Amino acid sequence: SSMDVTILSHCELSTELAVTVTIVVTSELVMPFTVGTWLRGVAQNWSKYAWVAIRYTYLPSCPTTTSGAIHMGFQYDMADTLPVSVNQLSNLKGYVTGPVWEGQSGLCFVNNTKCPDTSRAITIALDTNEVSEKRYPFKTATDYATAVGVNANIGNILVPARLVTAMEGGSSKTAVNTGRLYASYTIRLIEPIAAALNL
Amino acid sequence: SSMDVTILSHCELSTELAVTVTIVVTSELVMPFTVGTWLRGVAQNWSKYAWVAIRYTYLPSCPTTTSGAIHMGFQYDMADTLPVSVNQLSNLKGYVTGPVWEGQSGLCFVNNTKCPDTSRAITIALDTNEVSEKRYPFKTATDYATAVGVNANIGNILVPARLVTAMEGGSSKTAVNTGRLYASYTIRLIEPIAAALNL
Amino acid sequence: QAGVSMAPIAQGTMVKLRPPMLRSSMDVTILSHCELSTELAVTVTIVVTSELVMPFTVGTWLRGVAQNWSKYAWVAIRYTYLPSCPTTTSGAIHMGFQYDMADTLPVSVNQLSNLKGYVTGPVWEGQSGLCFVNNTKCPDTSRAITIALDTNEVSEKRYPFKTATDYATAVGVNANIGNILVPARLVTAMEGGSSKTAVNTGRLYASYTIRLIEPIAAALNL
Amino acid sequence: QAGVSMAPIAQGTMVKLRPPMLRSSMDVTILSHCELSTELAVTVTIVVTSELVMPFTVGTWLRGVAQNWSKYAWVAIRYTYLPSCPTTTSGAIHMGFQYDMADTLPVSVNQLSNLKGYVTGPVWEGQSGLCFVNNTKCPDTSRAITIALDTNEVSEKRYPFKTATDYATAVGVNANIGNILVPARLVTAMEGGSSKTAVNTGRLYASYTIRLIEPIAAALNL
Amino acid sequence: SSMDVTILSHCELSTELAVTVTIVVTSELVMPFTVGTWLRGVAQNWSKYAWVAIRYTYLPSCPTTTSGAIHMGFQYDMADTLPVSVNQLSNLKGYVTGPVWEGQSGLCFVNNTKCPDTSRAITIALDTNEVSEKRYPFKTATDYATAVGVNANIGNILVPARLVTAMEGGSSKTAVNTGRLYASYTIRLIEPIAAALNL
Amino acid sequence: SSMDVTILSHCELSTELAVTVTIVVTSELVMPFTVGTWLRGVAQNWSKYAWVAIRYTYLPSCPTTTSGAIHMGFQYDMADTLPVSVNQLSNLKGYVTGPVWEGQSGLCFVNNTKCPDTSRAITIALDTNEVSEKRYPFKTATDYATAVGVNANIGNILVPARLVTAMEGGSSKTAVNTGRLYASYTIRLIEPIAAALNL
Ligand SMILES: [Ca+2]
Ligand SMILES: [Ca+2]
Ligand SMILES: [Ca+2]
Ligand SMILES: [Ca+2]
Ligand SMILES: [Ca+2]
Ligand SMILES: [Ca+2]
């Protein structure tokens, strides 16, 4: 489909992770701006969009001898609290986890290979059906930020969901680079705007 | 129900009421937190939700000589103002009135029969088509409140509609209990979260 | 089975109002609706209240819409009543119409009884009227407590839409400047009573069909 | 004629019970009857009473016959209520079912309202139920105050016949030894009241159809 | 199916494990209360239920260099003894085992992915057909506990089965966190009760 | 048999008997532990079980001049009381009597022929439909006993029914052996366990 509507599919690096002795919980907004710097630079040219598909995969970079595990689940009320415990996080929406060294069976989502094994693959795809809003506008972090700090409920208007990632593992209380998170999306771009003017 | 979705139907007293010499106008948000206590404790472990069907019904509990009336109606943009008068209230979507002692033909809705006689059921059911958001986040009364407190317009994305109940009627300046309002819903439970974490 | 009644202890009636109906021909717009108008209560003694049958005054909704148009014409207006108290409550109701805005209101039931829609009934009665409010198909209104404008014998062919305040101001100059602004006023009486202190009885509804006619933005209409 | 009630001063109902019906296939015996179960009265305050839906407990007759057989199965059990006071009496009734014999009873109407046969009604109502007791052909039970076992979702396929005392003793060891002996207990609530002192309201009847099954002399059945 | 009957499916963390030098044998009751804290909070709202499906999967969190193995089998007479030896445990009903580092090929049961490899997956599903009782009531630990201590045969009324897990492995006589057990169930909830009243 | 289930059929003497001057009433639980010794040693390595069919038959072994009779019947709620008299016993499900020397037309049941003549087989077979529990746990006599000792009602879930055998008849105050009672069952063996571990 390509009219006034533009569709594009891509795959890139959302972020990198490392493990400590203790548990660390992060969150990523799942909006075009913050998903990757590529999409980010492409999407700015359009006013609003909707996710046809998006998904995060983790790829190991360590030896078989590292010690930790990644976890992830989606959350949808920019107002609720982040989990604080594996258990809690355990009943989020794409709950998925494994040892920081596992995961290779995920190139595929990156790769764009048809591979009959998801056997295991630290991957979480969004439930792109149950989003609150028909479509969402392009929001630029700093704005989002600003708004969310007025009341943490406005964000609910601005983003379909938030990824939670917890790095628990621990060998050292020092930070160990264990692998990376990659996003694979198919977005539907829609009311072109001069890039420069999009908050 | 799917392995992602949960469908739940139920009945419950959403609230209890009385009448006086004069008018008193209440309002109750049509949010699973406020609809009843069970729905609360259940819905609670889901992040989003969607009303498949929702209905308030009344059941008399006083003597055939209790004098008075009930009036219910619906508002939908929280910036709007609760009707002052009954007058204003007789103009809302879903207006309904009846003597505080009538209403037991409605018992079938708490029951589940097939009210042959809906002709004299004091009931009211939501126009779920006309709801503004595809889905709604589960707000807690508090969060909700605080949120509104910033700029009511925000409640507009936190909820579908607000019910307005007027109790005019009376003999005593002393509230006399007349009935009870029960809820009948078919909620669409949606993306788990650990209770504790919800606002 | 004739000449045999069965006295209930209470008359139950469940009103479930119908959505407004609007439909535009070329320049005329026709609106038909029903809203609740007043709440009534009785006292040990007579009590005459009264109402202007002008659109601003008739309904909370009406006024807000009807205001977008310069002048209307009534096609139908009905005042129908419905009980709330048990058939043990004492006191009846009376209503009738008046037309020269300068005429003083009646003070006697006697008086009241010769007005144009003279209708009266014990305060506990009224459930026959229900169809008029619900607007259902009426059963037998023999005994209803309804009153309807004598729409065809009004003085002006059309009336301008007036705001209360504009009215008032006008009336204040000379009460019968008023005689244009409104076609008639409804008169209510509550006598029969028992308590010296007011006992709430019923409430009454208005049901109209009005012609709307020479569009104006609301802000400019007074 | 719609949305129009007529409040009576009293609901009359004349119960004339039908003779028990017994009929034996080869090993199963089927019994269908209805006996009166309890009398109810209201108070200024809430009052939760409760009943075991086991055959000894359900009827004065039942118990005496049903006892000649080792284990039964319910096929139907209905609790239906009927008023005795005038429609001026204050207070309603509530009933619902419970199933883990170890669960504490509800203390709130709120509470009570989410149980399996939740049913409630002003204490003066109930005459719709009549056919169930008489067992006549039912007219329109829209408004009856009945509750019926969810016979097909009981825990055991069959239950042994227990004497109260045997039960008790058992229960006393551990309340949920009980969970075999009975399939469910009925819960009753009387709130709404007016007098601080109890006012008698209605009474309720049981109507069952039970499977009887592995004959034993009564003397040996506990 | 959703009437008076409610069905829901979920997946969460049942518990975490660690290995020593010696053999440790545990047991988990497989009832809604004790299966996870989520189900637990949801199920309390209903009087009795029956398992349509339930199953435990173990997910590694270690390096490839840990030393131990998990084992598990179901047991059904709240009165029989726990196994005391691998061998014994070896002929329980879902006998399944592997090195505390293996298992990843199990996300899937968690994940809810269709994955043609169970190749290996430390997973054990209950034989939800051969349960003693048609349905079971909601029992709250402390009660269960209490009852079972009257006579360890009453529990047989209250629970369909018990999971046995043995952690044998041993590097250190200290406890090593090796991974976690996750439950995946599909339960059929049935006679709603105020939560607060359910023992 | 499945790879989960085992079906086993067999014959065995469940018990031996004699008669006296007077009456003596015995009872034997219809539990694989007590039905015969083999069933015991076999059933033993299974946790649960279910009777597909079970039948007691008698076979005379005394002279055509031994005087006396046998009476069997079934009880099903262990709280119940063993009949005192024969009288009470002639009223139980399955009542049967015969002279202690008759009964060999029943030999076909120990055999497996097709008793053309069941008209004079002193036999008794269980109404497996009417059993209370879908399945039964394998109890040991002891455990069972101890269990009952708390509150017979508990036996109700430990077993389907109890057989009552009355031996009235006689010439000597001295028991004279008359026959033997054999069992014929088709057990449904169900979820393995290591013998040693069973109670
Ligand atoms: Ca923008
Ligand atoms: Ca929330
Ligand atoms: Ca004007
Ligand atoms: Ca018994
Ligand atoms: Ca319980
Ligand atoms: Ca055993």
Side-chain angles (χ1 to χ4, degrees):
Chain A
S1 177
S2 277
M3 335 244 157
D4 330 272
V5 160
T6 304
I7 290 215
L8 70 103
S9 295
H10 198 15
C11 185
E12 46 177 336
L13 163 87
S14 188
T15 188
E16 11 216 61
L17 337 92
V19 253
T20 60
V21 293
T22 41
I23 304 118
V24 199
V25 165
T26 337
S27 74
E28 276 314 341
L29 298 167
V30 20
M31 106 207 28
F33 185 91
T34 24
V35 164
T37 69
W38 183 92
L39 196 230
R40 144 102 101 268
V42 174
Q44 42 181 10
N45 294 98
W46 280 270
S47 260
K48 63 311 147 29
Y49 75 98
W51 285 121
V52 163
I54 180 146
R55 169 226 218 88
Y56 306 92
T57 327
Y58 155 102
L59 287 203
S61 53
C62 345
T64 59
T65 196
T66 325
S67 266
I70 174 187
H71 302 237
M72 38 220 201
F74 289 96
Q75 181 154 284
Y76 307 88
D77 184 6
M78 283 354 222
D80 326 316
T81 298
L82 291 60
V84 123
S85 131
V86 129
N87 190 142
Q88 304 212 338
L89 172 36
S90 157
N91 33 14
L92 233 49
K93 214 274 140 148
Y95 198 40
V96 83
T97 147
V100 298
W101 43 275
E102 202 33 279
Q104 196 60 156
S105 170
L107 239 196
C108 178
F109 294 40
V110 198
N111 204 171
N112 217 191
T113 277
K114 182 140 280 199
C115 1
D117 75 348
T118 313
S119 297
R120 51 273 267 275
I122 336 290
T123 231
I124 193 179
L126 165 70
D127 60 322
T128 198
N129 268 165
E130 286 1 319
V131 286
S132 297
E133 304 295 80
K134 234 154 165 154
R135 22 281 299 198
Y136 290 86
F138 196 164
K139 275 339 279 267
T140 168
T142 83
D143 198 312
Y144 177 86
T146 271
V148 160
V150 160
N151 180 303
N153 251 148
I154 304 185
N156 262 23
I157 313 250
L158 302 111
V159 308
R162 113 217 290 181
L163 182 51
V164 141
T165 96
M167 304 294 253
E168 156 272 301
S171 202
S172 309
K173 119 219 96 115
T174 43
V176 203
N177 282 248
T178 198
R180 317 172 204 263
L181 198 73
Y182 296 87
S184 253
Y185 49 94
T186 287
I187 195 166
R188 185 214 157 133
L189 281 39
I190 246 173
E191 336 203 33
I193 195 175
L197 267 206
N198 201 332
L199 316 204
Chain B
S1 328
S2 149
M3 293 214 255
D4 286 85
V5 198
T6 284
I7 289 97
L8 180 104
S9 295
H10 199 330
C11 214
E12 183 153 35
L13 14 11
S14 163
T15 180
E16 334 192 56
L17 13 51
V19 280
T20 51
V21 231
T22 89
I23 304 195
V24 5
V25 172
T26 338
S27 113
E28 288 286 4
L29 296 335
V30 195
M31 165 193 177
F33 173 108
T34 10
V35 146
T37 309
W38 184 105
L39 214 234
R40 192 159 58 230
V42 187
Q44 171 105 273
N45 342 244
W46 278 279
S47 333
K48 246 161 31 311
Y49 83 80
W51 283 123
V52 180
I54 206 200
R55 169 185 238 115
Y56 299 79
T57 330
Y58 174 98
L59 299 187
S61 170
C62 54
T64 320
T65 66
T66 315
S67 97
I70 184 181
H71 313 237
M72 323 179 298
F74 291 147
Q75 287 193 160
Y76 319 81
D77 116 49
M78 254 84 227
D80 273 344
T81 298
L82 296 204
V84 147
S85 169
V86 215
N87 269 37
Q88 322 171 291
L89 157 19
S90 73
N91 327 150
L92 287 125
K93 212 288 167 223
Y95 182 73
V96 181
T97 329
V100 274
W101 62 262
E102 171 56 49
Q104 228 197 194
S105 311
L107 174 284
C108 69
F109 292 163
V110 217
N111 244 166
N112 204 132
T113 313
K114 221 277 303 205
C115 256
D117 215 352
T118 55
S119 213
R120 74 192 52 168
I122 287 138
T123 193
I124 186 185
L126 178 67
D127 47 287
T128 28
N129 354 120
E130 314 303 2
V131 185
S132 287
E133 311 292 73
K134 287 276 86 181
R135 284 82 227 282
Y136 289 120
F138 168 147
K139 289 321 241 105
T140 65
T142 332
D143 205 296
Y144 173 55
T146 290
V148 136
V150 179
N151 176 99
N153 278 2
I154 297 164
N156 284 156
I157 58 268
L158 277 43
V159 153
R162 116 180 93 194
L163 164 64
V164 177
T165 156
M167 291 274 258
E168 88 172 285
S171 297
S172 282
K173 242 93 169 86
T174 247
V176 158
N177 286 149
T178 68
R180 260 195 285 259
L181 218 191
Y182 303 76
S184 299
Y185 45 104
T186 310
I187 210 308
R188 177 173 156 121
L189 271 353
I190 250 185
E191 35 233 58
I193 175 141
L197 274 205
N198 212 334
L199 313 157
Chain C
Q1 194 202 231
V4 167
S5 268
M6 298 222 151
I9 228 303
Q11 281 195 176
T13 39
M14 300 60 139
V15 176
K16 31 108 227 272
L17 277 191
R18 245 187 224 162
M21 181 195 309
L22 249 80
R23 147 254 110 159
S24 162
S25 293
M26 324 186 55
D27 328 80
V28 328
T29 266
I30 291 303
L31 152 58
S32 254
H33 199 13
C34 149
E35 52 211 70
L36 139 52
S37 199
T38 282
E39 287 128 79
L40 249 17
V42 137
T43 172
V44 103
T45 212
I46 249 230
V47 158
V48 177
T49 148
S50 100
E51 211 94 12
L52 279 205
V53 182
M54 110 188 167
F56 178 108
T57 275
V58 181
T60 13
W61 197 75
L62 186 43
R63 97 202 306 144
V65 350
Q67 175 169 213
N68 286 96
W69 271 276
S70 278
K71 314 179 268 222
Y72 58 96
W74 287 115
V75 181
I77 173 116
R78 208 170 199 103
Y79 290 98
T80 146
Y81 176 91
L82 303 153
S84 254
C85 41
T87 20
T88 57
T89 346
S90 328
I93 179 188
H94 310 252
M95 81 191 135
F97 284 124
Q98 281 200 308
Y99 310 82
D100 154 39
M101 292 297 94
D103 282 324
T104 77
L105 305 191
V107 264
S108 141
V109 170
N110 184 82
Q111 245 167 182
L112 207 291
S113 82
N114 340 292
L115 256 39
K116 221 289 170 180
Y118 185 70
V119 61
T120 179
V123 94
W124 46 258
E125 186 82 58
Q127 63 134 265
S128 292
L130 183 71
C131 44
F132 296 78
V133 168
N134 263 146
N135 96 296
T136 267
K137 183 198 115 30
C138 286
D140 164 289
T141 70
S142 203
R143 17 202 302 156
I145 288 161
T146 243
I147 181 195
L149 219 210
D150 62 310
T151 219
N152 66 286
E153 227 118 26
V154 146
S155 265
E156 299 310 59
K157 88 173 55 315
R158 339 267 105 123
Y159 291 71
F161 175 110
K162 267 349 208 72
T163 68
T165 111
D166 202 275
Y167 181 71
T169 290
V171 189
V173 175
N174 183 101
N176 82 171
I177 277 192
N179 285 146
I180 317 150
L181 316 177
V182 295
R185 62 151 162 273
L186 157 76
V187 167
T188 307
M190 314 251 153
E191 57 143 297
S194 194
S195 278
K196 349 72 243 180
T197 19
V199 180
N200 313 288
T201 281
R203 58 222 187 274
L204 107 171
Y205 294 82
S207 21
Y208 51 108
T209 314
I210 195 193
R211 240 155 82 94
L212 259 44
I213 233 128
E214 39 207 11
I216 181 173
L220 305 185
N221 199 349
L222 314 142
Chain D
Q1 194 202 231
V4 167
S5 268
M6 298 222 151
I9 228 303
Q11 281 195 176
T13 39
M14 300 60 139
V15 176
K16 31 108 227 272
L17 277 191
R18 244 187 224 162
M21 181 195 309
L22 249 80
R23 147 254 110 159
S24 162
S25 293
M26 324 186 55
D27 328 81
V28 328
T29 266
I30 291 303
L31 152 58
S32 254
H33 199 13
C34 149
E35 52 211 70
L36 139 52
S37 199
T38 282
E39 287 128 79
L40 249 17
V42 137
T43 172
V44 103
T45 212
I46 250 230
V47 158
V48 177
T49 148
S50 100
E51 211 94 12
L52 279 205
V53 182
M54 110 188 167
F56 178 108
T57 275
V58 181
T60 13
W61 197 75
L62 186 43
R63 97 202 306 144
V65 350
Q67 175 169 213
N68 286 96
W69 271 276
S70 278
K71 314 179 268 222
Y72 58 96
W74 287 115
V75 181
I77 173 116
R78 208 170 199 103
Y79 290 98
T80 146
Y81 176 91
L82 303 153
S84 254
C85 41
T87 20
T88 57
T89 346
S90 328
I93 179 188
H94 309 252
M95 81 191 135
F97 284 124
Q98 281 200 308
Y99 310 82
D100 154 39
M101 292 297 94
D103 282 324
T104 77
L105 305 191
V107 264
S108 141
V109 170
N110 184 82
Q111 245 167 182
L112 207 291
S113 82
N114 340 292
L115 256 39
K116 221 289 170 180
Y118 185 70
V119 61
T120 179
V123 94
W124 46 258
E125 186 82 58
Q127 63 134 265
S128 292
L130 183 71
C131 44
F132 296 78
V133 168
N134 263 147
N135 96 296
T136 267
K137 183 198 115 30
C138 286
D140 164 289
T141 70
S142 203
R143 17 202 302 156
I145 288 161
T146 243
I147 181 195
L149 219 210
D150 62 310
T151 219
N152 66 286
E153 227 118 26
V154 146
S155 265
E156 299 310 59
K157 88 173 55 315
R158 339 267 105 123
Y159 291 71
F161 175 110
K162 267 349 208 72
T163 68
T165 111
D166 202 275
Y167 181 71
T169 290
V171 189
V173 175
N174 183 101
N176 82 171
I177 277 192
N179 285 146
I180 317 150
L181 316 177
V182 295
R185 62 151 162 273
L186 157 76
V187 167
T188 307
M190 314 251 153
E191 57 143 297
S194 194
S195 278
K196 349 72 243 180
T197 19
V199 180
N200 313 288
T201 281
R203 58 222 187 274
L204 107 171
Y205 294 82
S207 21
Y208 51 108
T209 314
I210 195 193
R211 240 155 82 94
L212 259 44
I213 233 128
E214 39 206 11
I216 181 173
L220 305 185
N221 199 349
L222 314 142
Chain E
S1 177
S2 277
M3 335 244 157
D4 330 272
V5 160
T6 304
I7 290 215
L8 70 103
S9 295
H10 198 15
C11 185
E12 46 177 336
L13 163 87
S14 188
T15 188
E16 11 216 61
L17 337 92
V19 253
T20 60
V21 293
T22 41
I23 304 118
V24 199
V25 165
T26 337
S27 74
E28 276 314 341
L29 298 167
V30 20
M31 106 207 28
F33 185 91
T34 24
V35 164
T37 69
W38 183 92
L39 196 230
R40 144 102 101 268
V42 174
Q44 42 181 10
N45 294 98
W46 280 270
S47 260
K48 63 312 147 29
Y49 75 98
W51 285 121
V52 163
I54 180 146
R55 169 226 218 88
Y56 306 92
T57 327
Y58 155 102
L59 287 203
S61 53
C62 345
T64 59
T65 196
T66 325
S67 266
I70 174 187
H71 302 237
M72 38 220 201
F74 289 96
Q75 181 154 284
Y76 307 88
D77 184 6
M78 283 354 222
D80 326 316
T81 298
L82 291 60
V84 123
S85 131
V86 129
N87 190 142
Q88 304 212 338
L89 172 36
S90 157
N91 33 13
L92 233 49
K93 214 274 140 148
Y95 198 40
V96 83
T97 147
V100 298
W101 43 275
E102 202 33 279
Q104 196 60 156
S105 170
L107 239 196
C108 178
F109 294 40
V110 198
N111 204 171
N112 217 191
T113 277
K114 182 140 280 199
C115 1
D117 75 348
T118 313
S119 297
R120 51 273 267 275
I122 336 290
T123 231
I124 193 179
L126 165 70
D127 60 322
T128 198
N129 268 165
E130 286 1 319
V131 286
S132 297
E133 304 295 80
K134 235 154 165 154
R135 22 281 299 198
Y136 290 86
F138 196 164
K139 275 339 279 267
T140 168
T142 83
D143 198 312
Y144 177 86
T146 271
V148 160
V150 160
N151 180 303
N153 251 148
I154 304 186
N156 262 23
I157 313 250
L158 302 111
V159 308
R162 113 217 290 181
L163 182 51
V164 141
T165 96
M167 304 294 253
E168 156 272 301
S171 202
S172 309
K173 119 219 96 115
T174 43
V176 203
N177 282 248
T178 198
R180 317 172 204 263
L181 198 73
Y182 296 87
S184 253
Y185 49 94
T186 287
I187 195 166
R188 185 214 157 133
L189 281 39
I190 246 173
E191 336 203 33
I193 195 175
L197 267 206
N198 201 332
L199 316 204
Chain F
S1 328
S2 149
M3 293 214 255
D4 286 85
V5 198
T6 284
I7 289 97
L8 180 104
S9 295
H10 199 330
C11 214
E12 183 153 35
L13 14 11
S14 163
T15 180
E16 334 192 56
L17 13 51
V19 280
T20 51
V21 231
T22 89
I23 304 195
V24 5
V25 172
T26 338
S27 113
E28 288 286 4
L29 296 335
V30 195
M31 165 193 177
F33 173 108
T34 10
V35 146
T37 309
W38 184 105
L39 214 234
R40 192 159 58 230
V42 187
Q44 171 105 273
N45 342 244
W46 278 279
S47 333
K48 246 161 31 311
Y49 83 80
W51 283 123
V52 180
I54 206 200
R55 169 185 238 115
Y56 299 79
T57 330
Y58 174 98
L59 299 187
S61 170
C62 54
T64 320
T65 66
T66 315
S67 97
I70 184 181
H71 313 237
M72 323 179 298
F74 291 147
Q75 287 193 160
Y76 319 81
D77 116 49
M78 254 84 227
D80 273 344
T81 298
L82 296 204
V84 147
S85 169
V86 215
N87 269 37
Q88 322 171 291
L89 157 19
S90 73
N91 327 150
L92 287 125
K93 212 288 167 223
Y95 182 73
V96 181
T97 329
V100 274
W101 62 262
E102 171 56 49
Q104 228 197 194
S105 311
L107 174 284
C108 69
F109 292 163
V110 217
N111 244 166
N112 204 132
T113 313
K114 221 277 303 205
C115 256
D117 215 352
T118 55
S119 213
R120 74 192 52 168
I122 287 138
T123 193
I124 186 185
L126 178 67
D127 47 287
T128 28
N129 354 120
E130 314 303 2
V131 185
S132 287
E133 311 292 73
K134 287 276 86 181
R135 284 82 227 282
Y136 289 120
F138 168 147
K139 288 321 241 105
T140 65
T142 332
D143 205 295
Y144 173 55
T146 290
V148 136
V150 179
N151 176 99
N153 278 2
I154 297 164
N156 284 156
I157 58 268
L158 277 43
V159 153
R162 116 180 93 194
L163 164 64
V164 177
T165 156
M167 291 274 258
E168 88 172 285
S171 297
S172 282
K173 242 93 169 86
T174 247
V176 158
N177 286 149
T178 68
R180 260 195 285 259
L181 218 191
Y182 303 76
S184 299
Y185 45 104
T186 310
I187 210 308
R188 177 173 156 121
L189 271 353
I190 250 185
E191 35 233 58
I193 175 141
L197 274 205
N198 212 334
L199 313 157

